[PDB]
Amino acid sequence: GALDVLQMKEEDVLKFLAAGTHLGGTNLDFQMEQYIYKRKSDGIYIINLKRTWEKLLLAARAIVAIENPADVSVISSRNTGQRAVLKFAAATGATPIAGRFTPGTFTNQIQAAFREPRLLVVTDPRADHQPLTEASYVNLPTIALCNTDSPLRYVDIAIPCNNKGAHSVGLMWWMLAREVLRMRGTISREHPWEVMPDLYFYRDPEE
RNA sequence: AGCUCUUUCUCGAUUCUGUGGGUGGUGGUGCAUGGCCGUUCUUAGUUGGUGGAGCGAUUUGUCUGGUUAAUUCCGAUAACG
Numbered sequence: 001g002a003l004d005v006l007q008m009k010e011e012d013v014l015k016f017l018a019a020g021t022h023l024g025g026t027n028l029d030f031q032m033e034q035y036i037y038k039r040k041s042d043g044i045y046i047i048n049l050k051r052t053w054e055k056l057l058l059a060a061r062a063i064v065a066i067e068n069p070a071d072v073s074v075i076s077s078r079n080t081g082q083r084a085v086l087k088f089a090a091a092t093g094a095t096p097i098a099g100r101f102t103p104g105t106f107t108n109q110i111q112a113a114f115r116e117p118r119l120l121v122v123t124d125p126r127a128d129h130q131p132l133t134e135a136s137y138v139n140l141p142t143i144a145l146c147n148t149d150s151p152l153r154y155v156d157i158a159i160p161c162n163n164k165g166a167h168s169v170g171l172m173w174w175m176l177a178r179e180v181l182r183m184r185g186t187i188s189r190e191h192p193w194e195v196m197p198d199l200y201f202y203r204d205p206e207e
Numbered sequence: 208a209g210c211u212c213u214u215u216c217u218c219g220a221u222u223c224u225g226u227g228g229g230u231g232g233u234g235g236u237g238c239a240u241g242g243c244c245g246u247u248c249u250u251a252g253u254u255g256g257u258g259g260a261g262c263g264a265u266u267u268g269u270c271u272g273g274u275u276a277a278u279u280c281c282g283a284u285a286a287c288g
């Protein structure tokens with residue numbers, strides 16, 4: 001949005017630059033091209049950082065529009081997102097799934113794990129492909145974190161970022177939790193937040 | 208064998224006689240059947256419900272690999288129980 005109270009600050013841009021979020025792959029799909037700045041002299045694509053903040057605020061404006069927070073469902077089958085989805089679902093009251101998704105969880109009405117959500121958020125479209133294709137049987141809207149070579153086939157909001165691993169995946173979930181809590185009125189739009197980004201990251205060498 | 212022939216005593220309503228109808232049968236059909244037994248077959252095999260795939264007969268589950276006397280376990284996984 002145009003508003004100064006929604007503008008991206010220097011201190012967020014330095015946190016993007018520090019985590020590698022702007023660095024894509026060597027390949028580009030034709031659906032992702034509007035999110036790209038340029039290709040480097042070494043064959044790597046640069047993701048446009050202002051495009052990310054608009055698509056992340058549009059995603060937060062979808063998540064705030066659900067009146068019961070337990071109706072939102074949150075997923076990661078790769079390890080680099082598992083700590084991050086567990087912390088996101090603690091900070092705001094969504095339902096997490098981590099590890100293997102069981103086929104038929106959304107469509108086998110009798111099943112012990114059966115559930116019926118209103119919004120679905122996924123960490124990587126190529127890896128999390130079961131809950132994406134299974135959402136096509138039940139009228140379920142979708143948000144996803146997309147790299148330059150991600151296949152867009154059932155996602156309704158794609159957020160441009162490096163999703164390969166490490167600090168970049170944890171930072172995106174932390175920043176999405178910050179803005180949903182801000183615009184619902186639970187924390188300040190000006191005072192810094194008490195939760196450090198480093199709480200969401202995956203398994204750097206411990207000692 | 209009073210079976211039958213000659214003879215002349217005996218019993219007492221129980222039988223005899225014609226028609227209808229029964230009853231019995233190690234008689235016929237095991238290619239009309241039940242029950243029982245043998246064999247395919249001594250091996251590891253077989254099947255619903257709800258979900259997914261095909262216009263359909265059908266299929267997945269019931270598996271690439273390792274392990275076991277074993278569809279026995281581990282694990283993998285559009286299937287779950």
